[PDB]
Amino acid sequence: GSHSMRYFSTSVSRPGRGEPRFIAVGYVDDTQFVRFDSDAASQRMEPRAPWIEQEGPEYWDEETGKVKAHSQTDRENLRIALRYYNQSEAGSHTLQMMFGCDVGSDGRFLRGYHQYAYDGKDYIALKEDLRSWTAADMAAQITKRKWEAAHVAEQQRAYLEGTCVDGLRRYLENGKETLQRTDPPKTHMTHHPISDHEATLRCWALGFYPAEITLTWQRDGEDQTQDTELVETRPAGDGTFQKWAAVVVPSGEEQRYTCHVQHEGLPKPLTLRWEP
């Protein structure tokens, strides 16, 4: 299947209490493999997955240099954003960045990303053509015009179609046993009477990787998405994920309701019925 590599950065200004906190985190699909935290003692890019410890000291030196440099740039970008929006120096602000690439099963480049958010809102994003920018408001439009003039799209395109996909591919090889492992969901159904006239059917998926999954209730072959309590896919803490879907159902009509599970790990669609 398709794979992704993402780096997620968060800078938070803390006026009075020193320079901004910077935290970066790297993922292949739903597996974290590195972190960096400007507040931590180590002052290094740090491993967070077994298969990244393969990389030699030159990798950790070079990766540490690059993320430190990012941290110093986004500390200045926080100051520039203050200026562009005319904000007080008294307040805490957030600059988030995401960048990375997708590859197909063939290992070929599919999609690249390079984008920022200021105070939880879209600031600037590289569009899919990796040639042009979506700028949210008139402040981001200032950065957009500067970045058009300085050919920044061309710079990021070279990273996204080059180092990004080369890195992702090397990681998918070296960590093959982790990253190209599919763990199918372990599924069951519960029944909880509310009364003699209604019951809650809860459909469970446990211990699956990756996180991508569809849990769907049907009543006689028809989607019940408006009536289904669907919780956010959630980490178990061991590298696998958890999800449930619940419907409340007329007592005597349980057999009308089917739970449908789709996961990359399932050879075939699972249909679950209440089988007491």
Binding site: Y7, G26, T73, I80, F99, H114, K146, Q155
Partner: peptide
């Protein structure tokens, strides 16, 4: 692999 040469707003 991190990208490099980060750009001012």
């Amino acid at each position: 692999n991190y990208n490099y040469r980060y750009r001012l707003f």
